[PDB]
């Protein structure tokens, strides 16, 4: 048994609709968002891996393309695009494709983030 | 386990020395580091806010402790007479857990390549 | 002389209005922008510095707070908010209050950037 | 309650993956700047205020580190299929006997891709 | 002088070995690195596009050379029989300058802490 | 036109700035993980393919590095006012005799700021 992870960065705009009126997050802004997908499972004795890192990247690509260079709030389910909401939303998009998914981390900035484990 | 965790990272610039190491050990000399602290909290996400707590509330809760550490000599702070990573991590937990009840871990990195994670529950 | 620099990070939305339909930069998006301010000058013999890093931060603060947590295209002069335009714009905003400014770098992502020198 | 210590090491090596399909890039001879994080979990001594000195963990790993660094991994027995997963297991198997409090080994082949192994 | 410069960074994973170091020198054993290459260009900013050239255009121009380097053994590429950072930075300049006429410098880093800049 | 080599080193040290005003935070005893970049410029030898081995640059700096690392800077002669600016010049002065091709010294007290000295 082991864990594997792969990291991705996407460039997007968002705003938080439910913060108080003068809160900076309530203004239209953006971030270089980092996403880490983590899987946990058994290592195949012939391949020597769980799945190819490239399969994890390929599995994310359709979701990446929806998020990257986009305004998140216009995506159904991301009307309140906090890191927490986004981590769970990503889990829900990728879990069908990556059944070994064990954690999704979203970082809005280099110093803050959240980790969702479904 | 199933969970949702939030974390926020802070950096502070401080001097320390380790008082119990062998004579001549480099840690025994007055020196310092760019310390990194990561506070992690575990909780439920409110359906209206969409968050556990605002990152800014975490930063504000930590501020008093942060200001005691930054641009200071750690050995002068009570509880930090032996200011190892491990001692500092637990000390920070003890200071913060009262104002951040959902605190689940404290990480302290003395350098970019070496550190400690403390879970106090 | 000696050169000093300091890095600032701001979180902002932008959109490039003059790219072809379909170009990714033409959609409303954002980045965590990095700005490096570089200054060059004489080190005072008594202070041991050119200017305090904090004095540089304070000088930039007004301009920083126009950029951070904002949509760049709404700022006059940033209607086409490329890295190149933004670096020159920051130079033009900051040079009056930091006469020793020698270069401005803007990075939209960690792996690329622009450097402008206005003299 | 628990305390975990960790230290990161970087080594410069070549490898190739022998069991990937014909034209897979990882099947060609190449290399990486590999990063290894060793994590320890255990009691912190009330006198020393640490689990063990970072320097002692470095020393414990040094023999294995020197086998890896500036080498071709496939040549090392046990690393004939030197995936991140296999390497992390292998490092654990070398280091656990010297550092019984070892609780995880992370290997990153690149800055964006990695695996964490936590024992058998 | 008054000027605008752009740069973009690319990382490739490759093996190399230095053939002219003394027997025993670590760099003379087959090994590898996650190499970083930065291309710097300088030119006028077009008043319509607001840019010198699109970052994507610089990436595209470099791709053929990038593909020769990534997931390969450098010593087997003609011109890179002695694949030092110095030699590699110049070799990259020679490959890229014809397709990126605004190219002003090439940086190679073999590790995160050591590298070389060539200006032609 | 030129080939430049560089190598980065990190050392862990205490310092305080003695000529800032009372209550300025840098006036309190503190420390940093300092980063130093040494740069050299010169001809690439066709036989070795290098200017000097990165390992030679590290060895040449080691004595100076060992004075700095895990020490209190203010007690080192020359570093009574251990600003980044003063430190970069001091390192230059210490290193230039054993690294004649030295062309720049950068010092960073934190990851977001620094100083470059070029002689
Ligand atoms: C300041 C800023 O730009 C935001 O996007 C914030 N986002 C969050 C936030 N706190 C949490 N928990 N989650 C968040 O996603 N605070 C601010
Ligand atoms: C070298 C240096 O400057 C220190 O501050 C050291 N600190 C620790 C250490 N080991 C542990 N476990 N914890 C530490 O905090 N070793 C050295
Ligand atoms: C992809 C994206 O989000 C952008 O903002 C781009 N910006 C620039 C760019 N190229 C230059 N030169 N300047 C840029 O500012 N390409 C893309
Ligand atoms: C692309 C490249 O250079 C490789 O070394 C790959 N390695 C792995 C890999 N996938 C897993 N799971 N583990 C690996 O170790 N994919 C590619
Ligand atoms: C240790 C190692 O793996 C190497 O690749 C070395 N490369 C160089 C080197 N020195 C220079 N100047 N250039 C180099 O390219 N030293 C070692
Ligand atoms: C805040 C702090 O800990 C310091 O060490 C400072 N150092 C400098 C500084 N400014 C310059 N120019 N040089 C410095 O070296 N400001 C503060
Ligand atoms: Zn935001
Ligand atoms: Zn220390
Ligand atoms: Zn953009
Ligand atoms: Zn590989
Ligand atoms: Zn090498
Ligand atoms: Zn300081």
mmCIF file of N, CA and C in Angstrom, chain B residues 14-73:
data_model
loop_
_atom_site.group_PDB
_atom_site.id
_atom_site.type_symbol
_atom_site.label_atom_id
_atom_site.label_comp_id
_atom_site.label_asym_id
_atom_site.label_seq_id
_atom_site.Cartn_x
_atom_site.Cartn_y
_atom_site.Cartn_z
ATOM 1 N N UNK B 14 13.993 34.897 13.900
ATOM 2 C CA UNK B 14 14.384 34.900 15.333
ATOM 3 C C UNK B 14 15.740 34.312 15.606
ATOM 4 N N UNK B 15 16.294 34.683 16.769
ATOM 5 C CA UNK B 15 17.525 34.062 17.280
ATOM 6 C C UNK B 15 17.178 32.996 18.303
ATOM 7 N N UNK B 16 18.028 31.958 18.379
ATOM 8 C CA UNK B 16 17.945 30.973 19.435
ATOM 9 C C UNK B 16 19.307 30.333 19.631
ATOM 10 N N UNK B 17 19.395 29.600 20.723
ATOM 11 C CA UNK B 17 20.520 28.691 20.995
ATOM 12 C C UNK B 17 19.993 27.509 21.747
ATOM 13 N N UNK B 18 20.613 26.352 21.561
ATOM 14 C CA UNK B 18 20.219 25.181 22.272
ATOM 15 C C UNK B 18 21.164 24.971 23.472
ATOM 16 N N UNK B 19 20.598 24.982 24.682
ATOM 17 C CA UNK B 19 21.453 25.018 25.883
ATOM 18 C C UNK B 19 21.978 23.634 26.334
ATOM 19 N N UNK B 20 21.429 22.523 25.840
ATOM 20 C CA UNK B 20 21.761 21.177 26.341
ATOM 21 C C UNK B 20 22.606 20.333 25.420
ATOM 22 N N UNK B 21 23.068 20.901 24.307
ATOM 23 C CA UNK B 21 23.829 20.098 23.374
ATOM 24 C C UNK B 21 25.283 19.978 23.819
ATOM 25 N N UNK B 22 26.002 18.988 23.270
ATOM 26 C CA UNK B 22 27.438 18.849 23.580
ATOM 27 C C UNK B 22 28.273 20.124 23.339
ATOM 28 N N UNK B 23 29.287 20.359 24.168
ATOM 29 C CA UNK B 23 30.172 21.494 23.966
ATOM 30 C C UNK B 23 30.691 21.465 22.540
ATOM 31 N N UNK B 24 30.605 22.598 21.861
ATOM 32 C CA UNK B 24 31.095 22.691 20.504
ATOM 33 C C UNK B 24 30.075 22.375 19.413
ATOM 34 N N UNK B 25 28.949 21.741 19.756
ATOM 35 C CA UNK B 25 27.815 21.556 18.813
ATOM 36 C C UNK B 25 27.379 22.946 18.273
ATOM 37 N N UNK B 26 27.147 23.022 16.969
ATOM 38 C CA UNK B 26 26.876 24.297 16.339
ATOM 39 C C UNK B 26 25.581 24.919 16.860
ATOM 40 N N UNK B 27 24.610 24.086 17.228
ATOM 41 C CA UNK B 27 23.327 24.592 17.757
ATOM 42 C C UNK B 27 23.487 25.302 19.098
ATOM 43 N N UNK B 28 24.577 24.993 19.809
ATOM 44 C CA UNK B 28 24.890 25.632 21.099
ATOM 45 C C UNK B 28 25.390 27.062 21.027
ATOM 46 N N UNK B 29 25.754 27.527 19.849
ATOM 47 C CA UNK B 29 26.188 28.876 19.655
ATOM 48 C C UNK B 29 24.955 29.717 19.368
ATOM 49 N N UNK B 30 25.001 30.973 19.782
ATOM 50 C CA UNK B 30 23.960 31.972 19.431
ATOM 51 C C UNK B 30 23.875 32.013 17.905
ATOM 52 N N UNK B 31 22.696 31.737 17.376
ATOM 53 C CA UNK B 31 22.440 31.838 15.937
ATOM 54 C C UNK B 31 20.955 32.144 15.740
ATOM 55 N N UNK B 32 20.422 31.920 14.548
ATOM 56 C CA UNK B 32 19.032 32.181 14.307
ATOM 57 C C UNK B 32 18.595 31.535 13.004
ATOM 58 N N UNK B 33 17.315 31.730 12.698
ATOM 59 C CA UNK B 33 16.675 31.081 11.530
ATOM 60 C C UNK B 33 15.518 31.943 11.059
ATOM 61 N N UNK B 34 15.104 31.688 9.808
ATOM 62 C CA UNK B 34 13.819 32.124 9.286
ATOM 63 C C UNK B 34 12.862 30.963 9.547
ATOM 64 N N UNK B 35 12.143 31.032 10.663
ATOM 65 C CA UNK B 35 11.263 29.947 11.080
ATOM 66 C C UNK B 35 9.949 30.001 10.306
ATOM 67 N N UNK B 36 9.429 28.846 9.951
ATOM 68 C CA UNK B 36 8.089 28.733 9.366
ATOM 69 C C UNK B 36 7.184 27.941 10.319
ATOM 70 N N UNK B 37 5.992 28.485 10.556
ATOM 71 C CA UNK B 37 4.925 27.833 11.332
ATOM 72 C C UNK B 37 3.726 27.603 10.454
ATOM 73 N N UNK B 38 3.197 26.395 10.488
ATOM 74 C CA UNK B 38 1.921 26.090 9.825
ATOM 75 C C UNK B 38 0.913 25.690 10.878
ATOM 76 N N UNK B 39 -0.190 26.404 10.903
ATOM 77 C CA UNK B 39 -1.301 26.056 11.836
ATOM 78 C C UNK B 39 -2.335 25.299 10.990
ATOM 79 N N UNK B 40 -2.765 24.125 11.449
ATOM 80 C CA UNK B 40 -3.856 23.372 10.761
ATOM 81 C C UNK B 40 -5.024 23.235 11.697
ATOM 82 N N UNK B 41 -6.226 23.370 11.141
ATOM 83 C CA UNK B 41 -7.451 23.197 11.905
ATOM 84 C C UNK B 41 -8.277 22.184 11.146
ATOM 85 N N UNK B 42 -9.074 21.404 11.845
ATOM 86 C CA UNK B 42 -9.972 20.426 11.244
ATOM 87 C C UNK B 42 -11.400 20.713 11.725
ATOM 88 N N UNK B 43 -12.334 20.825 10.799
ATOM 89 C CA UNK B 43 -13.732 21.056 11.175
ATOM 90 C C UNK B 43 -14.717 20.874 10.054
ATOM 91 N N UNK B 44 -15.954 21.280 10.329
ATOM 92 C CA UNK B 44 -17.005 21.236 9.307
ATOM 93 C C UNK B 44 -17.145 22.573 8.592
ATOM 94 N N UNK B 45 -17.490 22.504 7.309
ATOM 95 C CA UNK B 45 -17.659 23.683 6.491
ATOM 96 C C UNK B 45 -19.124 24.169 6.630
ATOM 97 N N UNK B 46 -19.295 25.410 7.040
ATOM 98 C CA UNK B 46 -20.622 26.020 7.123
ATOM 99 C C UNK B 46 -21.183 26.167 5.724
ATOM 100 N N UNK B 47 -22.445 25.748 5.494
ATOM 101 C CA UNK B 47 -23.019 25.818 4.147
ATOM 102 C C UNK B 47 -23.204 27.240 3.639
ATOM 103 N N UNK B 48 -23.380 28.226 4.514
ATOM 104 C CA UNK B 48 -23.538 29.609 4.030
ATOM 105 C C UNK B 48 -22.200 30.284 3.733
ATOM 106 N N UNK B 49 -21.269 30.190 4.669
ATOM 107 C CA UNK B 49 -19.972 30.845 4.462
ATOM 108 C C UNK B 49 -19.149 30.099 3.401
ATOM 109 N N UNK B 50 -19.342 28.785 3.307
ATOM 110 C CA UNK B 50 -18.503 27.926 2.480
ATOM 111 C C UNK B 50 -17.122 27.714 3.060
ATOM 112 N N UNK B 51 -16.927 28.024 4.336
ATOM 113 C CA UNK B 51 -15.609 27.783 4.928
ATOM 114 C C UNK B 51 -15.699 27.294 6.351
ATOM 115 N N UNK B 52 -14.575 26.841 6.898
ATOM 116 C CA UNK B 52 -14.503 26.450 8.304
ATOM 117 C C UNK B 52 -14.416 27.742 9.120
ATOM 118 N N UNK B 53 -13.344 28.507 8.940
ATOM 119 C CA UNK B 53 -13.246 29.875 9.434
ATOM 120 C C UNK B 53 -12.437 30.612 8.378
ATOM 121 N N UNK B 54 -12.554 31.928 8.310
ATOM 122 C CA UNK B 54 -11.774 32.746 7.368
ATOM 123 C C UNK B 54 -10.302 32.583 7.661
ATOM 124 N N UNK B 55 -9.475 32.392 6.630
ATOM 125 C CA UNK B 55 -8.005 32.385 6.851
ATOM 126 C C UNK B 55 -7.587 33.581 7.693
ATOM 127 N N UNK B 56 -8.216 34.733 7.471
ATOM 128 C CA UNK B 56 -7.835 35.910 8.209
ATOM 129 C C UNK B 56 -8.102 35.795 9.715
ATOM 130 N N UNK B 57 -9.097 35.004 10.121
ATOM 131 C CA UNK B 57 -9.401 34.819 11.555
ATOM 132 C C UNK B 57 -8.300 33.984 12.182
ATOM 133 N N UNK B 58 -7.770 33.031 11.417
ATOM 134 C CA UNK B 58 -6.649 32.253 11.894
ATOM 135 C C UNK B 58 -5.443 33.158 12.096
ATOM 136 N N UNK B 59 -5.142 33.976 11.084
ATOM 137 C CA UNK B 59 -4.025 34.905 11.194
ATOM 138 C C UNK B 59 -4.177 35.831 12.421
ATOM 139 N N UNK B 60 -5.381 36.353 12.615
ATOM 140 C CA UNK B 60 -5.627 37.287 13.715
ATOM 141 C C UNK B 60 -5.497 36.606 15.085
ATOM 142 N N UNK B 61 -5.994 35.364 15.216
ATOM 143 C CA UNK B 61 -5.876 34.577 16.456
ATOM 144 C C UNK B 61 -4.404 34.312 16.832
ATOM 145 N N UNK B 62 -3.567 34.094 15.823
ATOM 146 C CA UNK B 62 -2.138 33.838 16.015
ATOM 147 C C UNK B 62 -1.306 35.063 16.289
ATOM 148 N N UNK B 63 -1.816 36.218 15.874
ATOM 149 C CA UNK B 63 -1.029 37.442 15.918
ATOM 150 C C UNK B 63 -0.283 37.721 17.221
ATOM 151 N N UNK B 64 -0.949 37.636 18.385
ATOM 152 C CA UNK B 64 -0.264 37.875 19.652
ATOM 153 C C UNK B 64 0.988 36.999 19.850
ATOM 154 N N UNK B 65 0.879 35.716 19.534
ATOM 155 C CA UNK B 65 2.000 34.753 19.693
ATOM 156 C C UNK B 65 3.071 35.079 18.659
ATOM 157 N N UNK B 66 2.634 35.324 17.422
ATOM 158 C CA UNK B 66 3.553 35.679 16.369
ATOM 159 C C UNK B 66 4.432 36.863 16.750
ATOM 160 N N UNK B 67 3.829 37.878 17.340
ATOM 161 C CA UNK B 67 4.576 39.079 17.717
ATOM 162 C C UNK B 67 5.584 38.855 18.866
ATOM 163 N N UNK B 68 5.315 37.894 19.733
ATOM 164 C CA UNK B 68 6.302 37.424 20.734
ATOM 165 C C UNK B 68 7.525 36.700 20.113
ATOM 166 N N UNK B 69 7.326 36.026 18.986
ATOM 167 C CA UNK B 69 8.389 35.256 18.335
ATOM 168 C C UNK B 69 9.195 36.071 17.348
ATOM 169 N N UNK B 70 8.529 36.863 16.499
ATOM 170 C CA UNK B 70 9.208 37.562 15.430
ATOM 171 C C UNK B 70 10.145 38.653 15.912
ATOM 172 N N UNK B 71 11.349 38.650 15.351
ATOM 173 C CA UNK B 71 12.376 39.609 15.712
ATOM 174 C C UNK B 71 12.666 39.582 17.203
ATOM 175 N N UNK B 72 12.759 38.383 17.753
ATOM 176 C CA UNK B 72 13.055 38.188 19.160
ATOM 177 C C UNK B 72 14.087 37.047 19.335
ATOM 178 N N UNK B 73 14.601 36.925 20.565
ATOM 179 C CA UNK B 73 15.489 35.838 21.036
ATOM 180 C C UNK B 73 14.647 34.815 21.817
#
